């Protein structure tokens, strides 16, 4: 039954990412004055399916072992990185899972650098080196902010987190920390306004958008949600899914609106605006439970 | 008669102002309501954590009495 659990996880990742692409394209269309796409079939579903098919039948051409090894790592992260996400009963009860999130984000940085090395000595690989540098400049911020938002939760176990979110949401004790972390999720997804940047393009594209859905599900679990009532977990599943959907639409909706940074403005902004503010909010979150006598039950 | 395209006796004017409402809250009010909801969340957080510690101590006492 355990391989059946694995198949019920990683068969809807294909449908999830493909229908995510139609959802984001339709949503951008209605953000503008566009009905795109609706002509190709009933409300545009066979258009992403058959378009994925056409992308698989492109017949491209060509170091070969490196070109093999990069997108296989990207998509095996995209598969193996929905394991401890506690849609009510998670797949593996990891004692620590958030540090596993950080480690596999670093593996995504490996993937980008291997693709840039496989790109065979190009001004594109210099740009991809810069993209590796900007992507690696974010796991400091994400780990430190994640450390502070678990500090009010005691353990790394994330079931304790779903215990903590019953009374009020955790968005209220840490809202600006959450704001900086959500900007870091925009940062880690390598999309707008944080840009730029051959095949197999379907597998690489799949890796990026499964990484997006992972970051949005983890955002939804980390800060808000509903209550885990046993012997009817589907209620929590539905409410969690609705909130994660609204957050992902908001995520693409913020992508729909602003021009993208300058690279040096991005570094300048990152260090000289997030990084002291992270440290200051984090030391305040350290000294907070000793001044409220509320340290969480680290069991 | 002649049938050109004239304006009929003069038309209405059309504005040329950078019409901006600049609405929303001020600095002090938005700042204070954010910090107020923050402190509300802190108080409820403190209450739930200390009652949770009470129950977790009860769980400790369960494992103590169970052991020998």
First-to-last C-alpha distance (Å) of chain B: 117
**A293·B37 Cβ contact <8 A:** no
| H-state helical runs in chain A | 2-10, 12-31, 46-56, 64-80, 98-118, 123-136, 139-151, 159-164, 176-188, 201-223, 234-255, 263-269, 275-290
Which of B41, B44, B53 would best serve as a mutation to test chain A binding (most A beta carbons within 10 A)? B41
Using DSSP's 3-state secondary structure scheme, residue A78 falls into helix
Q: Is the dihedral of CA A129, A131, A134, A139 positive or negative?
A: negative
Tell me which residue of A205, A192, A212, A224 sits closest to A81, measured CA to CA.
Answer: A212
Tokens 């068969």 locate to A11
Cα distance from A164 to chain B (closest Cα, Å)? Answer: 8
Residues of B in contact with A152 (CB under 8 A): 45
Q: How far is CA A223 from CA A3, A10, A275, B22, in A?
A: 31, 25, 21, 31
For B56, which of A164, A166, A297 is closest by C-beta distance? A297
| Minimum-distance CB partner of A294 among B37, B38, B45 | B45
Torsion of CA B26, B29, B31, B34, to 10 degrees: -130
- Give the tokens for residue B1: 């008669």
Interface touch A292/B42, C-beta < 8 Å: yes
What sign does the dihedral B56-B57-B63-B66 (CA atoms) show?
negative
**Alpha carbons A108 and A80: distance in angstroms, whole number:** 12
| Minimum distance, in Å, between the CA of residue B14 and any CA atom of chain A | 26
Q: From chain A, pick out residues whose CB is under 8 angstroms from the CB of B53.
A: 294-295, 297
Largest CA distance in chain A: 64
Close Cβ partners of B19 (under 8 Å, ≥ 6 residues apart): none
CB atoms within 10 A of CB A127: 15
Candidates B41, B42, B49; nearest CB to A296: B49
**What residues 6-65 of chain B have any CB closer than 8 A to a CB of chain A?**
34, 37-38, 40-42, 44-46, 48-50, 52-53, 56, 59
Distances (CA, A) of A228 to A96, A239, A280: 20, 10, 33
Q: Which residues of A20-33 are buried (b: 16+ CB within 10 A; e: fewer)?
A: bbbbbbbeeeeeee
Contact between residue A275 and residue A140 where contact means Cβ atoms under 8 Å apart: yes
CB contact under 8 Å between B42 and A288, yes or no, is yes
CB B45 within 8 A of CB A289: no
> Minimal CA–CA distance to A183: which of A138, A140, A134?
A138
Q: Which two tokens stand for residue A71?
A: 């997108």
Q: How was this structure obtained?
A: cryo-EM
Would you say A168 and B45 are in contact if contact means Cβ atoms under 8 Å apart? yes
Q: Enter the DSSP assignment of A120.
A: -
**What residue has token string 């059946």?**
A4
Distance from CA of A100 to the nearest CA of B (A): 26
Take residue B28 and report the two structure tokens written for it: 């002090």
Distance between CA atoms of residues A57 and B34, nearest Å: 54
- Taking a C-beta distance cutoff of 8 angstroms, is the pair A178, A223 a contact? yes
Residues composing chain B: 68
Instruction: Return the residue in B38, B49, B51, B53 with the most chain A beta carbons within 10 A, the one to mutate for interface testing.
Output: B49
Structure tokens at A22: 């139609």
Residue of chain B with shortest Cα separation from A165: B45
Taking each helix axis from N to C end, the angle separating A12-31 and A46-56, rounded to the nearest 10 degrees, works out to 120
Kindly report the three-state secondary structure assignment for every residue of B3-68. Answer: CCCCCCCCCCCCCCCCCCCCCCCCHHHHHHHHHHHHHHHHHHHHHHHHHHHHHHHHHHHHHHHHCC
Contact A104, A77 (CB under 8 A): yes
Q: Using an 8 Å Cβ cutoff, are A288 and B41 in contact?
A: no
Burial level of A92, CB count in 10 A (0-12/13-18/19+)?
exposed
Positive or negative: CA dihedral A136, A140, A146, A149: negative
- From A117, A107, A101, select the one nearest A73 (Cα to Cα): A107
Which of A289, A234, A256 has its CA nearest to residue A23?
A256
> What are the Cα distances from residue A53, in Å, to A18, A58, A60, A149, A158?
11, 9, 14, 42, 38
For chain A, what are the domain ranges? 1-299
Chain B residue whose CA is closest to A295: B49
């Amino acid at each position: 039954m355990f391989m059946i659990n694995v198949l019920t996880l990683i068969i809807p990742i294909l449908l999830a990412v493909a229908f995510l692409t139609l959802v984001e394209r339709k949503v951008l269309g209605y953000m503008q004055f566009r009905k795109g796409p609706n002509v190709v079939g009933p409300y545009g579903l066979l258009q992403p399916i058959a378009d994925a098919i056409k992308l698989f039948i492109k017949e491209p051409l060509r170091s070969i072992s490196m070109f093999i090894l990069a997108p296989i790592l990207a998509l095996t992260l995209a598969l193996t990185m929905w394991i401890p996400l506690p849609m009510p009963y998670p797949l593996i009860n990891m004692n620590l899972g958030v540090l596993f999130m950080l480690a596999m984000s670093s593996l995504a940085v490996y993937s980008i650098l291997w693709s840039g090395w496989a790109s065979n000595s190009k001004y594109a690989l210099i740009g991809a080196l810069r993209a590796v540098a900007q992507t690696i400049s974010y796991e400091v911020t994400l780990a430190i902010i994640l450390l502070s938002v678990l500090l009010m939760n005691g353990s790394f176990t994330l079931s304790t987190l779903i215990i903590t979110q019953e009374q009020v949401w955790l968005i209220f004790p840490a809202w600006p920390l959450a704001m900086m972390w959500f900007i870091s999720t925009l940062a880690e997804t390598n999309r707008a306004p944080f840009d730029l940047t051959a095949g197999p393009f379907a597998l690489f594209f799949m890796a990026e958008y499964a990484n997006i859905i992972m970051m949005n599900i983890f955002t939804t679990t980390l800060f808000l949600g509903a209550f885990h009532n046993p012997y009817m977990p589907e209620l929590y599943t539905i409410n969690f899914t609705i909130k994660s959907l609204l957050l992902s639409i908001t995520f693409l909706w913020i992508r729909a609106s602003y021009p993208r940074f300058r690279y040096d403005q991005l570094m300048h902004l990152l260090w000289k605006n997030f990084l002291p503010l992270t440290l200051a909010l984090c030391m305040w979150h350290v000294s907070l439970p000793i001044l409220l006598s509320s340290i969480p039950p680290q069991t | 008669v002649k049938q050109d395209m004239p304006p009929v006796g003069g038309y209405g004017p059309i504005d040329y102002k950078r019409n901006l409402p600049r609405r929303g809250l001020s600095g002090y009010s938005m700042f204070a309501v954010g910090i107020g909801a923050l402190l509300f969340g802190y108080w409820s957080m403190m209450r739930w954590n200390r009652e949770r510690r009470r129950l977790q101590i009860e769980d400790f006492e369960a494992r103590i009495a169970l052991m020998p």
